[PDB]
Amino acid sequence: FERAKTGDIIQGLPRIEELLEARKPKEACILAKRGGEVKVVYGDGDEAIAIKVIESNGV
DNA sequence: TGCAAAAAACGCATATTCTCTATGCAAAAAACGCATTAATACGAGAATTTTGTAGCTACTTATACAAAATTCAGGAAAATTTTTCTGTATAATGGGAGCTGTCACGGATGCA
């Protein structure tokens, strides 16, 4: 089962230092070059759990 | 239970009279004066005489040389303790002791 890794005893003394020295909050790395739109749900038509990201103007 | 009323007491007629307010007597204190004697103090004399001043004299000390008769600081032996060095001869042939339950981070390497 998906299970709680959320919180609402969250964002406390630890959840700030990770931004103070500016570490890797979420360690993500999404890019940008503008398109941008609903983009199906994951890029191109998505599919069974397919995964991509988003586009409007762009090449 | 209202008084009218009688007798004896209790109130308007003086003797008595007796504490009482009132002056002359008298006796001894006292204090004042006659006063007398003695003592408290003035006068003179020369005697002691201590203090005040000078010079002499004896004691006391200012000072100038220094090795007195005694203290001490090294110097150089011992005296005993202690310290460093050297030496003693069978065989002996690879070292124990915890680290193994922390979370998270930042490089820094290895390993295909």
Curated annotation (Swiss-Prot):
Give the source's domain of life in one word. Bacteria
Instruction: Locate the transmembrane regions by residue number.
Output: none
Family assignment from sequence similarity:
Belongs to the RNA polymerase beta' chain family. RpoC2 subfamily.
> Subunit info?
In cyanobacteria the RNAP catalytic core is composed of 2 alpha, 1 beta, 1 beta', 1 gamma and 1 omega subunit. When a sigma factor is associated with the core the holoenzyme is formed, which can initiate transcription.
What is known about what this protein does?
Answer: DNA-dependent RNA polymerase catalyzes the transcription of DNA into RNA using the four ribonucleoside triphosphates as substrates.
Stated name of the protein: DNA-directed RNA polymerase subunit beta'
Q: Organism source for this protein?
A: Nostoc sp. (strain PCC 7120 / SAG 25.82 / UTEX 2576)
Q: Could you say which residues of the full protein are shown?
A: 1004 to 1062 of 1355
